[PDB]
Paper text:
Here, we present a general computational method termed ‘localized reconstruction' for solving structures of symmetry-mismatched parts of macromolecular complexes. The method allows symmetry-mismatched and/or flexible subunits to be treated as isolated single particles separate from the rest of the complex, facilitating their classification, refinement and reconstruction. To demonstrate how localized reconstruction can be used to address symmetry-mismatched components, we focused on the RNA-dependent RNA polymerase of bacteriophage φ6.
We apply the method to two published cryo-EM data sets, namely unfixed COPII cages and the VP4 spikes of triple-layered rotavirus particles, in addition to an unpublished data set of polymerase complexes of double-stranded RNA bacteriophage φ6. Others have previously located the RNA-dependent RNA polymerase under the fivefold symmetry positions in the rotavirus and under the threefold symmetry positions in bacteriophage φ6 polymerase complex using conventional icosahedral reconstruction. Such an approach applies incorrect symmetry to the symmetry-mismatched structures, such as the polymerase in these studies. The main requirement is that the macromolecular complex is amenable to single particle averaging and that its orientations can be reliably determined first.
Residue numbers in the entry:
A (entry chain B): 1 to 761
B (entry chain A): 624 to 761
C (entry chain A): 417 to 485
D (entry chain A): 1 to 70
E (entry chain A): 417 to 554
F (entry chain A): 278 to 346
The structure:
Amino acid sequence: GFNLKVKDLNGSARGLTQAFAIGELKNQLSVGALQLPLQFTRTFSASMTSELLWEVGKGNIDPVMYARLFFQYAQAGGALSVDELVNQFTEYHQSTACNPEIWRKLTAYITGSSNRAIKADAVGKVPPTAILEQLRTLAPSEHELFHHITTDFVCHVLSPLGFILPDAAYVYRVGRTATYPNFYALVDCVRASDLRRMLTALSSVDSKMLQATFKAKGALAPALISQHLANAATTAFERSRGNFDANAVVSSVLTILGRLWSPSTPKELDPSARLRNTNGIDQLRSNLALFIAYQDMVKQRGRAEVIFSDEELSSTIIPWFIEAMSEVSPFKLRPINETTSYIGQTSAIDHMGQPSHVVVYEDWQFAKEITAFTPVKLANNSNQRFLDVEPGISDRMSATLAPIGNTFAVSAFVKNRTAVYEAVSQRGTVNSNGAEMTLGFPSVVERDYALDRDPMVAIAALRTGIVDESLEARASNDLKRSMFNYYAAVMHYAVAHNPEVVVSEHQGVAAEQGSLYLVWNVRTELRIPVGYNAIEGGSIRTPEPLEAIAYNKPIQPSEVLQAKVLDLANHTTSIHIWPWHEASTEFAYEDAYSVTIRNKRYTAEVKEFELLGLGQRRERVRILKPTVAHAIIQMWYSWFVEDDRTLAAARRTSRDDAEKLAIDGRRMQNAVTLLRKIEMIGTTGIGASAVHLAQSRIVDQMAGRGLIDDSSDLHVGINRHRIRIWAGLAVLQMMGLLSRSEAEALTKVLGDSNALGMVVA
Amino acid sequence: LKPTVAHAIIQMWYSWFVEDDRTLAAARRTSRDDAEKLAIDGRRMQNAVTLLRKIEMIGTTGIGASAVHLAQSRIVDQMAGRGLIDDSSDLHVGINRHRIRIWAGLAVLQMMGLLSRSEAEALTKVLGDSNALGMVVA
Amino acid sequence: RTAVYEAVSQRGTVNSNGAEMTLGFPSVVERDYALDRDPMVAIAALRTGIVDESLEARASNDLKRSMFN
Amino acid sequence: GFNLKVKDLNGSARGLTQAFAIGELKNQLSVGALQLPLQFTRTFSASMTSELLWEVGKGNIDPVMYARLF
Amino acid sequence: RTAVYEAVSQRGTVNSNGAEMTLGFPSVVERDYALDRDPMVAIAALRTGIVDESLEARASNDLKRSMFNYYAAVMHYAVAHNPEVVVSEHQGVAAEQGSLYLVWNVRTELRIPVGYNAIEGGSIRTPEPLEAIAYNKP
Amino acid sequence: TNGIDQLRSNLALFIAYQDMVKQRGRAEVIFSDEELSSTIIPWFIEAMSEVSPFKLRPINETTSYIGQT
C-alpha cells in the first residue's frame, strides 16, 4: 500500500490532485465555485477480471471475437495503438482486389483451375492455413494475426455444406484487461468498431452467397461464387473506406459533452435543445469516469475544437455511436448504485476523534493454485507451441501457498496496518497537521506489473507528481496509463461514495474557461480542521476527492474479489498457439544460502531441483507468475521501502529525541512486521523442506573438515530464526512471486534491527 | 485361414494410389501453367488427408487402440529404463499421434493376413510428404 | 480414380489415346492369390502376352490358367 | 527384503508406488481429490499354508477337485 | 533391527526421510523360491519397477507373477487402518481409458517429516498405501 | 440383481481394474447388452462357481498375518 498527508497532499503526491490532471503545475489550489449540479449513472467501466480462452479456427467467426483479440494484442503492446493495428491491417488487405489470385489460388486448393468446373467438393478443410501459409508466401504476414484471420472466409464453413471437417479449432488466452479508459483507449475502441463495421458484413455477404450458391448440381460448379467469395467483401472492404475518423469523433463527442458541462453560455458552447435530447447522451452526460477521460485528453491536446459536428443536424451522426454502445471494447457500460465499490473503511480514534490513518484499501484473494507449462514446440518450428499442463511444482507449491492464502490476506494486512494505530506519545495527541493517507489498489499493480515494468517507479513519479519523462515511448505509455488509471480509479470510487458533484473552472490560465474540475460536499464530519477546508460551513466544499475520502465513515467491501484463475487442459489438448510468451521459459532458479558459525564459511548453495523431492530439473517447464500474487506483496514491498527511506529521512531531519522514539518504534515495527511474517513463512512445508534439507547439506559440510564434524554447533537460538528467513527466501524468489532486488532490501532491513524472534519461537 | 477377396481390394487400392501420385506428381512436374499445378498439388493433399482419416478407423476403434496402448507402455517404460521419463510428453499430439495411430491401424492390418509390409513403409512414405499436417486428430 | 480424370486438363486428344482405364479385376487376383501364386507376376505376363515359360506343371500353366479366365 | 526412502519412494521403488500400477508417471504423482466412498470390503481368503494330499482315486469322479488340481 | 533403531543418534529428521524399514516379506520369497527362481532378483526388479524383459514365458512373466502379489500385499493391511477410500480416476493429460486407485485419510499425529504429501491437516489423505502404515501405530 | 450387489460388497477384487486398464486399456463391455449382464454373466462369475485357490472371506484375516512394529 501507500500513503499521504491529509492536510497536505500536493506536497505529498501531486498526482492525486485534480490540478495535476489539469496540469495546474503545483501552484494555486483549485476552489473557484459557481457551480452546476450533477448525477450518477455510476459511469461506464470495464470488467476487472476476465481470464479466459477464446476458440478460433473452428470456423464460426464473429467480429466481436476478433475485436477482443486485437484489443488485447495492443494491450500486450504487440505493436502500439489499436488504431495502428488497424491502419496497418488495412495496409495488409490493401492486398484486396490487386490479388484476385487469392481467389484463384484458394479455389485452386478447391481443385482447381476451376474452369474444369463440377460439384468438385470432397474434403480437406481446416488447414488452408498451411496452404494459406503459401498464401502467406502470396500475402506476407509479419503479424501472425491477420494471416490467421483471412483463412476464415474460405473456411468458416465455405462451402458451408462441405467442405467439411475441421475436427479442430485454434486458441487464444484473453486475460483481464485495463480497468478504465482514456483518449487513446477510446479511439482504439471506435477504431475497433470500424473493424466491427468490417467483419460482420464480411461474414454476412458470404452468408447469403452460400444461399445463392449450391444451386445444385450439389454445391454447384466453381470458378464462380468461389471465385467470387470475397470480392463483394472487398467491396465490403470498400464499404469500410469511411467509418469516421477516430480521434476526430472521439474529440467531438468529448468536447460537446464538455460544452454540456461548462457554465459558458454563448454560441460556441450552447448545446442545442434541438439535440440536448436524442437518446444516449441523456444518460451519457451522467458518466463521470468518462468525464475523467475528458479532462485528461483536454489536458494533453488542449481542446483543438474541430467541431466536426454542427449544432443539431447533424450533431447526431457524430454521436450516433460511442465505445460503451460498442461491444467491441472489453469495457462495458455500467448500471445504477454499486458503481465499482469494494473497499471497506476504518479510521484512527483519539477519542476526539479525527482520523489519523485513513485505511482506504484493497479487496482481493490471490490465486490458490498455478500451473507450469511444458513448451512442446513442434509444429511450424517457430512461435507455434503446445503447453500441456501437468502437475509438477504446481500442486505442492500451491498447497504451500494456501497458508500464504490465509496469512497474506489483505484484510489481515490492513488490520495490522490499522494497528499502527497509536503513535507520537499518547493518546490523544497523535494529531499534528497532516495525517497518513494509506491506500492502494489490486488493479493498478496487477496490470502495470503484468507489463513487467515495476509499478513503483511510476508510483514515485506520482509521489513527486512531475513525470520523469525520460522513458521509452513504450514506458511513456505505461506511465501514462498508470497515471490516469490511478487517478480515475480514485475519482469514481470517491464518487461512488459521495452522491453529489458540481463542475468547476478554473480559471488561472483559462485557457478559455473550458478547462475544468470538480468540487464535492459532505456534512457529517466533526468540527475539526482537515485539508485546506476546516470544514468550513458545516460542509466540505473541496476540489480534491481525497478530502471527501477521508471524512467518510467506516464501511465494508462488497465484490467477489476472487482471482478467478485460468484453466486450459481442454483447450490444451486443442492448442495450437497464440501470443503466450511471458512466463517465461525455465520455471525457476536457485538461491544460495550461507551462514557462519565457529567463524567458518559454509554456503549452503541450493537449487532448483524440484527441491520438493523428485528429480531432476525437471525438465523443462515454465509456470506463469500470477500478476496478482506478486503484485500484492509488491504493494507491501512499496510499504517497506516507503517507511524505510522516508522515515529514515525523518532520521535525518527531526533529530528530536521523542521523534527519535517515533522513528525507532515505526521502523522497528515494520521490522517486526516482516519479522513475524517471514517467521510464519518458515513453518511452511516447502519451508520445512528448505530447513531440513539445507541444514542436511551444511551438516554434511560439517563432515567436510573432520574436526568441525563434532556434531551440530549451529543450534542454540539465533541461528534458527536466522535461517528461518531462508524459507521466506525460497518463498521469495522462484516461488514464482518475488523478483529479487528484494531480499536485497530485506537483507538490509533485517540488518537494520536486532530482529531476534523477536520472541517466538 | 487365408482370407481372400479383400486382398484384391486393398491391393487395387494400393496400386491405384501408385497410379495416383505418379500421375499428379508428373502433372506438377509440367502442366504447366500454374492454375492446374496447385489444383493437383492441392488435390494431392486431401487424397492423403482422406486416407489419413480412414486409417484411424482402421485402428483406434477396435482393436488397435490396444496397439497404441501397449506402444505407449513400452515407450514410457523405456524412458524410465534409460532413466528419465522427463522428456516423455509423448502421449500427446499429431506428429507423434499420426505416427502411432497410422502405425496402429496399419498394424492390425498387418495382423490382418492381407497386404504385406512393403505396402506399409510405402504407405507411410506417402503420408510423410503429404503433408502430414492436420491437425485432424481427433 | 474416376475422380482423378479431370486431372489433368486440358483436352488431347488424338495424339495419345485413350487408355486402359478399365481393368482392376478383383477376380483375377483372387483366382491366383488363392494358391498364393501372386497374380501380379501374371499381370505383366499378359502385358507382353507371351508366357515367360517358367517350366513347371504347377508354375507356368497356372499362369496361363488365369490368362484364360 | 530391502529398503527405500519414504519421500523419494517414487524416485526409489518407483514401480512399487501403486501410481505405477497405473501408467502414471508425469510431473504429478497421481492423486488430487474427488468423490464416491465405500470401503471395498470382504476379500478372498487365505490360500497360504493348508497344504495336503488329495485323492483322484475313484472313477466316481469329482470334477470340482480336479479343477482345483488343474 | 528394531533394536538397531536407536543407532544411530541423533535426530534428523527432515533432511533425509524416513526409510522403507518395513518389508522383509517371507511370503514374497517363498512364492518364487518354491520354483527356485530366486526371488532376490525379482526384488531389484521392483526397485526400478520396470521388468528387465528376460523374454521367456517361464522367465519374465513369473517375475511379474510375483510383483502382483507384492502390490497385493500392502493394500490388504492398508484396508485395516483405515477404511478410508476414494481417490478419483486420474486421467492426467493422457489418456482417459480409466485410471482410479484408492486413497486413505487415516488419522494422524501433527507432524510430517514423512511423505511428500505434506497434507498433515488432521490427517494425510493419502495418495499411497504405505504412508498410512508410516503414520500407523506399531 | 441380488448378487452383483454382493459384488458391490466384494469390491476387494479391486486392482483387477487397475491392471485391467494397465494390461490392456479401454474396457468395452462389447457383449454388453443391457438386459445382460446382469441377467447371467455376473451370476456366472467364478468365485460363485468356486474353483481354484480363488478363496473367499471377510476383511482382515488375510491381513491377520501382517507383522507391525
